[PDB]
Structure formats: structure tokens, C-alpha cells
Amino acid sequence: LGVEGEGIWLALGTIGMLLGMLYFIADGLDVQDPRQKEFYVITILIPAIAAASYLSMFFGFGLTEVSLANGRVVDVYWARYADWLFTTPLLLLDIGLLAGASQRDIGALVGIDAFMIVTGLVATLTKVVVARYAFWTISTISMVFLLYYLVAVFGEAVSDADEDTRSTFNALRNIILVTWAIYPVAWLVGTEGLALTGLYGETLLFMVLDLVAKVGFGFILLRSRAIM
Amino acid sequence: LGVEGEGIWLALGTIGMLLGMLYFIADGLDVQDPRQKEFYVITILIPAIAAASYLSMFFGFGLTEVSLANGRVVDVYWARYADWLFTTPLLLLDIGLLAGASQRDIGALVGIDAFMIVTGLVATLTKVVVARYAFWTISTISMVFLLYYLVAVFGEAVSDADEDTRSTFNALRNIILVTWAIYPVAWLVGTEGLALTGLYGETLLFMVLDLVAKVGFGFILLRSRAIM
Amino acid sequence: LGVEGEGIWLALGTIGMLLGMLYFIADGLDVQDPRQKEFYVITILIPAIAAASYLSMFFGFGLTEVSLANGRVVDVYWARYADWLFTTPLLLLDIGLLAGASQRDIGALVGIDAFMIVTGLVATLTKVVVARYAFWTISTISMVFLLYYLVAVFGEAVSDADEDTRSTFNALRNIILVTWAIYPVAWLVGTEGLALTGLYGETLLFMVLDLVAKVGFGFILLRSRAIM
Ligand SMILES: CCCCCCCC/C=C\CCCCCCCC(=O)OC[C@@H](O)CO
Ligand SMILES: CCCCCCCC/C=C\CCCCCCCC(=O)OC[C@@H](O)CO
Ligand SMILES: CCCCCCCC/C=C\CCCCCCCC(=O)OC[C@@H](O)CO
Ligand SMILES: CCCCCCCC/C=C\CCCCCCCC(=O)OC[C@H](O)CO
Ligand SMILES: CCCCCCCC/C=C\CCCCCCCC(=O)OC[C@H](O)CO
Ligand SMILES: CCCCCCCC/C=C\CCCCCCCC(=O)OC[C@H](O)CO
Ligand SMILES: CCCCCCCC/C=C\CCCCCCCC(=O)OC[C@H](O)CO
Ligand SMILES: CCCCCCCC/C=C\CCCCCCCC(=O)OC[C@H](O)CO
Ligand SMILES: CCCCCCCC/C=C\CCCCCCCC(=O)OC[C@H](O)CO
Ligand SMILES: *C/C=C(C)/C=C/C=C(C)/C=C/C1=C(C)CCCC1(C)C
Ligand SMILES: *C/C=C(C)/C=C/C=C(C)/C=C/C1=C(C)CCCC1(C)C
Ligand SMILES: *C/C=C(C)/C=C/C=C(C)/C=C/C1=C(C)CCCC1(C)C
User: Which residues carry this modification: N6-(retinylidene)lysine (chains A, B, C)?
Assistant: First the structure.
């Protein structure tokens, strides 16, 4: 249900995340390697958070209307940003730990990533049209260089790891590059920006992206000898 | 004194936390070993935070009305969640340091704890009746993990410590086990859930639990020779 | 431009922060020593955050009305507190890293700093007049501790460092001591407190303080031989 029938995607996202979280738990039962276990904890928590936020959005909790100075009324599922505020740093930690990056470097990218999500939230909530696009631009600039440092910095951290770890890192990095880069596009073309698609199309697109960025990513990470 | 007299518990809550804080400050005046001091810092901050939360609640800040879809109007003190979001990980850090658990395992427990509290916040704030109980169930499920992992994982980390540390950990763990487990019962029987009792009684329940879970917990910890 | 023309300071503050972060970036293009690089990252993020917050206030997001219990209405720029909740701990990390303070010492100061900002936010948002001043007092007391522990505990940690590190620390410490201590005065005299001045003058004062506490501080830190 929802405002425009977009609830079907909120329900399926809820289910997709829960099934991924559950697979990950059953797959991690017979691991007691402390470092391997850490990868399971992180990678289970991520779709747990998302499942919870997707369910709250299904029930209408993360949903607010914003009347823009435009007169337009935007149906904002703000609970997304609550989800992303924690899971995108957890995702960055996950791949940082695989790459063997330093704590300096991981914290640097999480700080960058947080700035990306919070300026995206301001873009999403502010009523001043120019500010919405001003902050979407601010946020997209931070994403571009987050992705650059992810490639340049974590890439060089892993450059001295074994070949299985570098290859798992390359796959995970690639999932992030293609999948995360589309989020600002969905915001732009969905109802919070140019409104090229409705709340239904926009919610479907974030569902596909979230499921790939979390369950797809987690599956590839947890199935890789690199973490053993 | 509040909406339905509960101000008395908020006031006495304030005073007990503040007195607990002041005691802990007084008792750690000439502590200089870094590790012992760490315990004092954590264990002083915990009632500092709760005291501030109770005071804000006493004054009516952090009180909200929530109109449920069934027409019931619930007087929700949401400031508790602000408190718990920070004191419950600090409590977990406090006993994890005692147990000598890895920062992996404390972060793991802190992650489940945060999930517990925020899903509790959603259950308390959402208007949809079924969603309230849905998120109460996800949060209680997370609390069962947390406690299992508290007992299982911190217990094994404290198994190689001296005997005063093991016994101090056992005491503290039992305080968490008993008192923490009653919070979901409190929510369920109080005005946010089945309304078996009213906000006055529900507030009394939480005050008692907070004071045990923080001042009494902190008393047992700081008084122990295991912290030297 | 804003409520009372104070928007001029929000724009100049925006541009001032932006230009400080651009200077810092330009300054650190060829830094590759990790410790040196960490100082740059933190000290770039700080004005980046202040710039985004100032911009959002300029566009009126994070502006809100708070109507007190006595009928007075306060134009509350609450986005300040979102800015301060993150940049004041980063500033503490910066100088605590400079001072070679332990992670225990830094976390302690950051915990006190976080309490200072949140009780400041309560003071600013609460409607009960007595409460605003009670939480301003609470917040200011925490600041006195913070500044004291900064002087004592970071000063003690830097006491073993070389001549340029101590000297750089002293200058940074003194910037913190004089500039930070003026914020509660600004709150007290501005529209949040006694309203001796209005939002215009209040916003000018916070602008000057932020720029000195962030760009000025950043300049002194990043130009110092100590971080080499
Ligand atoms: C009105 C909204 C304005 C924007 C608010 C944005 C707030 C979020 C921004 C940043 C929060 C994340 C801070 C992240 C802080 C990272 C600091 C760091 O790099 O430390 C390295 C050391 O730990 C190594 O030992
Ligand atoms: C009735 C008022 C209730 C709220 C105020 C009471 C709670 C806060 C009291 C004072 C504000 C400062 C809190 C500061 C809490 C941080 C812990 C600390 O400073 O420890 C430093 C040393 O003592 C360690 O040995
Ligand atoms: C005009 C108001 C908005 C001002 C900010 C807009 C653009 C902010 C840009 C980035 C914000 C993210 C936090 C900045 C985080 C920088 C981390 C870093 O490693 O920096 C390296 C660079 O100096 C390149 O070598
Ligand atoms: C913005 C709020 C985010 C909330 C969501 C949590 C995000 C936590 C992720 C990284 C924290 C940085 C510390 C991560 C610790 C990883 C351990 C590690 O990286 O170990 C190698 C290092 O050399 C050992 O010091
Ligand atoms: C709403 C109120 C929020 C309040 C903020 C909540 C989050 C606190 C964050 C970090 C503190 C971590 C605990 C400190 C760990 C190190 C303590 C320490 O060891 O301090 C030793 C020093 O010598 C003497 O202070
Ligand atoms: C993200 C949801 C909000 C969470 C808000 C938390 C506020 C700070 C309180 C506890 C964090 C403790 C630090 C994280 C875990 C590290 C534990 C640690 O410091 O371990 C030290 C030990 O010496 C290693 O051997
Ligand atoms: C939309 C409203 C509903 C949203 C509900 C969810 C909100 C966030 C829940 C929990 C935060 C998780 C914070 C995780 C902090 C880091 C934990 C961690 O890093 O754990 C692994 C460790 O590194 C090695 O074992
Ligand atoms: C009012 C009741 C509300 C519901 C709350 C119910 C209690 C919480 C549930 C599970 C935690 C207890 C887990 C017990 C099993 C852990 C012990 C164990 O199996 O292993 C111990 C380990 O070996 C030692 O180091
Ligand atoms: C309600 C708010 C709750 C509190 C929110 C605070 C947010 C702080 C954000 C960034 C600063 C993170 C500072 C982390 C400091 C860790 C200590 C450390 O890194 O120590 C290094 C060690 O000494 C080797 O040099
Ligand atoms: C699990 C969730 C993930 C991986 C979400 C990532 C989200 C983003 C990369 C969002 C980016 C955005 C911007 C860069 C522009 C402003 C709009 C956002 C927040 C959608
Ligand atoms: C100092 C405060 C403490 C120790 C509070 C801990 C609180 C909880 C364990 C609360 C848990 C809850 C549930 C498990 C179900 C959802 C309702 C809550 C948030 C009360
Ligand atoms: C870069 C931002 C800085 C340096 C902000 C500093 C802010 C403070 C030191 C805040 C002080 C306050 C109190 C101590 C009293 C209550 C009002 C506050 C929050 C302004």
C-alpha cells in the first residue's frame, strides 16, 4: 500500500533484507575465527538495520510530507536516511577491514560518508527548491570523492594482500561504485527532484539498489575465502 | 507534577542519578591509574546523562503525545530513548572493559544494543497498532541476543581473569540480566503497550530500573577490587 | 537576509568556512605522512561541516520558532547544534592527537563535550523558562570541566613532547579556552537567553566565534611544524 502503492516494494525490501540477514546468520554458525566472525557481525547487522527501516516505512513510520516553496508536496520516506547513516559506514568498515586499511583511512571515509548522507537528508527535507538542489550537489560531490578515496586509498591498502583478498576487494569495490553512484541519480529523477518518476518508481529503484548494496554485497563478501 | 502525577518519579529519578553521580565523583577523587579512572569516567557519565534526561523529563521536555490508529492517546516520554541510546552502550563498555573483552566483541554488543533501543523508539512512536507490537517484538528479540552474547561472549573473555574480576563480572552481569529484561515487560504492561497500568506506574517502574541499572550497577563496579 | 537581516552573517560564515576548508585542502595536497594526513582530514571536515550547516541555516533549514511558556517566541537556529555535536569532538580529537593524549583521555573529553552540546540543545529548545536556564547552567558547568580537563589532562600528555608541539598545543589550547568560553555568554545575552541583543547581533557573534574556533584554529594547527 503506502501513498501510491509503493508499499509493495517496502514489503519486498523488508523480506529481501530479512532473508539475506537470515542466510548470513545460518552461514556463520560454524565460524569461531575472531576476524571472520567480525565480518559476519557487521554483514548481518546491515540488512537487520535495513529490514527494520523498510518495515517502519511499510507501516508508515518513516513517511512525512514536505510542502516546498514550489507548492509541490513531496512524500518523503525519511527513515531511509536513518538506515543509510549507519549501514553505509558499516559497509565501508566491512570493505575497509577486508582491504586491511588503517583506522585513519576507514574513519576518514566514514566521516566523508556521514557528510554525504546528512547533506542528502537536508536536500530531501528543505523546502527551498534551490537549497534542495544545492545540497544534492553538495552530497553528490562528497560521494564522488568518497568513491575516489575508496578506490585510491583502500585499493592501495589491499595492494599487498593475497590474490584472493584483492579479487574479493575488487568485486566489492565494483558493487559499491556502480550501485552507490546510482543513488543520487534516483533522487534526481524521483519525486524529490525532477519528478521524472513517481513515488512508486522511486521506491522500486531504491529497493533494487539497497538489496544489491547490502544482500548482494554481503553474499559476495561472506562467500569469499578472503575472510577466512 | 506532569501529566498524571508521574513528575514525582521524574524528580526523584533526577535526584538519585545526581546523588549517584556525585558519590561516584567523590569516591574517585584520588584515582590516578588510567584504567581505574576509565571506569570512573564511564560510570560517572552514565548517571550524568540519565540525570539530565530525567530533569528534562521533569520539566516536560521530551514528552510527546502519540495518537494511535485506534484513537488512544499515549503520553510518550521519548527522552528516555535519548538517554538509553548512550547509557546502554556505556554500560556495555563498562562491563566489557571489566571482562577484558575485545573491542570487536564490545562493538558487536554495542551494535545489537543500539538496534535494540532504536527499534524500541519506533515501537513507542509509531501510530499503527500492529507496528507497535511488531517493533516491540524485534527489540525484545534483539535484547535476547544481547543478553545471550553478554553472558556467552563476555563470560568467556572474563574466564581467564583473576577471581575477583570473575566474581565482580558475575555480579554485574546478573544485574544487567535481571533489570534489563524487565524493561520490555515495563513497556508492555505500561501505557505504551497493553496499558495494564498508567503513566504514573509505568514511570515508577522505569525509575526503579534505571536507578538499579545505573547507580546500583555503578556502585558494585566502582567498589570492587577488580577495578584496581 | 533572514528573520531580522541576520542572514548576512550566515552567508559570510558559509563563505568563510568554505574558503578555510579550501585553503586547508590546497595546503594538504602533497601530504603523505599518515599522521600528518590525519590532521588534515579532521581539520578539513570541521569547516566542511560548519559550511554545510551555515548554508542550511542561510536557506532557512534548521531555523525554527520556539514559543516559550511565557509567550515569548525565539527564532532558534537549531542546526548550530547539529554542527557543534560533531565539530567540537573533531576539534577535541585534533588537539588531543596533537597533544599525544591517550584514546581514554580523548574519549573522556569527547563524552563531556557531547553532554555539553546536548544539554545546550535542551536549554535552547525547552519551553519552560526555568528549564532553559537550568540546562544552560548544566551545560556551562560541563564546559568548565571540559576546559579544565583539556588544560590539565591534555597539557599533561603534551608535557613530554618537543618544544614546537607543546608550543603549538598551548596556542591551540588558548584559542579553545577564550573562544569556547564565549559561547555560553553569547547564548545568555542573545535571543535564547536574556535577549540583551537580538538575533542579528547573536548571529554575528556566533559567526565570529565559529570562524575563529574552526578556520583560525585550523590555520594555526595545519601551519605548525609539530604536525610534520
Ligand atoms: C545541518 C547539517 C550539517 C551537516 C552535518 C554533518 C554531520 C556528520 C559529519 C561527520 C560525522 C562523522 C565524523 C567522523 C569523524 C572521523 C574523524 C577521523 O578521521 O578520525 C581518525 C581517527 O579516529 C584515527 O585514529
Ligand atoms: C538536577 C540536575 C540534573 C542534571 C545535572 C546533574 C548531572 C550533570 C552534573 C554536572 C554536569 C557535568 C557532568 C559531567 C559528566 C562527565 C563525567 C565527568 O566529568 O567526570 C570527570 C571526573 O569527575 C572523573 O573522575
Ligand atoms: C558552500 C557550503 C558547502 C561547503 C562544502 C561543499 C563541498 C564540501 C567537500 C567535501 C565535504 C566532505 C568532508 C571533507 C572530507 C575530506 C577528507 C579528505 O581526505 O580530503 C582530501 C582533500 O583535501 C583532497 O586531497
Ligand atoms: C556516522 C555514525 C556511524 C555509526 C555506524 C558505525 C560505523 C563504524 C565504522 C567504523 C568506525 C571506525 C572504527 C572501526 C574499527 C574497525 C577495526 C579495524 O579497522 O582494525 C584495524 C586497525 O588497524 C585497528 O586499530
Ligand atoms: C545525550 C548525552 C550524550 C553524552 C555522550 C555519550 C557518548 C559518549 C562518547 C564517548 C565517551 C566514551 C567513554 C570515555 C572512555 C574513556 C574514558 C577515560 O578513560 O578517561 C580517562 C581520563 O584520564 C580522565 O577523563
Ligand atoms: C551507533 C549507535 C550509537 C552508539 C553510541 C555509543 C556511545 C559511546 C558508548 C560506547 C561506545 C564504545 C566504543 C565502541 C566499541 C569499542 C569498545 C572499546 O573501546 O574497547 C577498548 C578495549 O581496550 C579494547 O581492547
Ligand atoms: C528508521 C528507524 C528504524 C532504524 C532501526 C535501526 C537504526 C540503527 C540500529 C543500530 C545501529 C547499529 C550501529 C552499529 C555500530 C557498529 C557496530 C560494529 O561495528 O560491530 C562489529 C564490530 O566492528 C566487530 O565485531
Ligand atoms: C522477563 C523475561 C524477559 C525475557 C528475558 C529472558 C532472559 C534473556 C534471554 C536470554 C539471555 C540468557 C541466555 C542464557 C544462555 C547463556 C549461557 C550459555 O549458554 O553459555 C554460557 C557461557 O558458556 C558462559 O561463558
Ligand atoms: C550525542 C552525541 C554522542 C557523541 C557523538 C560524538 C561524535 C564525534 C564524531 C567524530 C569524532 C570522533 C572522535 C573519536 C576519538 C577516538 C579516540 C582516538 O581516536 O584515540 C587515538 C589514539 O590516542 C591514538 O592516537
Ligand atoms: C545501504 C544503503 C546505501 C548503500 C545507500 C547509499 C546511498 C547513497 C550513495 C546516497 C547518495 C545521495 C547523494 C550522493 C545525493 C543526495 C541524495 C542521496 C542521499 C540519495
Ligand atoms: C539505563 C537504562 C537501561 C539499562 C535501559 C535498558 C533498556 C532496555 C533493555 C529496553 C528494552 C526495550 C525492549 C527490549 C523492548 C522495546 C522496549 C524497550 C526499549 C523498553
Ligand atoms: C566549532 C564550534 C564550536 C567551537 C562550538 C562551541 C560551542 C560551545 C562551547 C557551546 C557552549 C554552550 C554552553 C556551555 C552553554 C549552553 C549553550 C552552549 C551550547 C552555546
Answer: 214
C-alpha cell of residue B113: 544494543
- C-alpha to C-alpha distance for C185 and C192, rounded to whole angstroms: 11
Q: Which residues sit opposite C74 in a β-bridge?
A: C66
Residue C66 dihedral angles phi and psi, to the nearest 5°:
-125, 115
> How far is Cα C190 from Cα B81, in angstroms, rounded to an integer?
31
| A71 DSSP 8-state letter | S
**A76 three-state secondary structure:** strand
Nearest to A158 by CA among A177, A172, A179: A172
Q: Which of B115, B125, B134 sits opposite A49 (nearest CB)?
A: B115
Asked if residue C152 lies in contact with residue C99, where contact means CB atoms within 8 angstroms, the answer is: no
Q: Which of B175, B228, B185 is nearest to B206 (CA)?
A: B185
CA-based angle A188:A193:A199, to the nearest 5?
Answer: 95
How far is Cα B1 from Cα B101, in angstroms, rounded to an integer?
43
Q: How far apart are CA A28 and CA C164, in angstroms?
A: 51
Interface of C with A (CB under 8 A): 34, 37-38, 41, 45, 48-49, 52, 55-56, 59-61, 82
| Domain housing A161 | 1-228
Task: Assign 3-class secondary structure to chain A.
Answer: CCCCCCHHHHHHHHHHHHHHHHHHHHHCCCCCCHHHHHHHHHHHHHHHHHHHHHHHHHCCCCEEEEECCCCCEEEEECHHHHHHHHHHHHHHHHHHHHHCCCHHHHHHHHHHHHHHHHHHHHHHHCCCHHHHHHHHHHHHHHHHHHHHHHHHHHHHHHCCCCHHHHHHHHHHHHHHHHHHHHHHHHHHHCCCCCCCCCHHHHHHHHHHHHHHHHHHHHHHHHCCHHHC
State the CATH number of the domain containing residue A64: 1.20.1070.10
Count of the separate structural domains present in chain A: 1
Do you know the residue count of chain B?
228
**Closest Cβ opposite residue A102 in set C34, C52, C61:** C34
> Residue B58, Cβ neighbours under 10 Å: how many?
25
User: A66 phi and psi, to 5 degrees?
Assistant: -120, 120
Q: What is the resolution of this structure in A?
A: 2.1
Amino acid (1-letter code) at residue B107: G
Closest CA to ligand 5's atom 7:
C111
Number of H helices, E strands in chain B: 10, 2
Distances (CA, A) of A138 to A159, A161, C51, C56, C148: 31, 34, 11, 11, 37
Chain A contacts of B138, Cβ < 8 Å? 52, 55
CB contact under 8 A, A125 and C61: yes
- Which residue of A103, A119, A145 is the best one to mutate when testing the C interface, meaning the one whose CB has the most C CBs within 10 A? A119
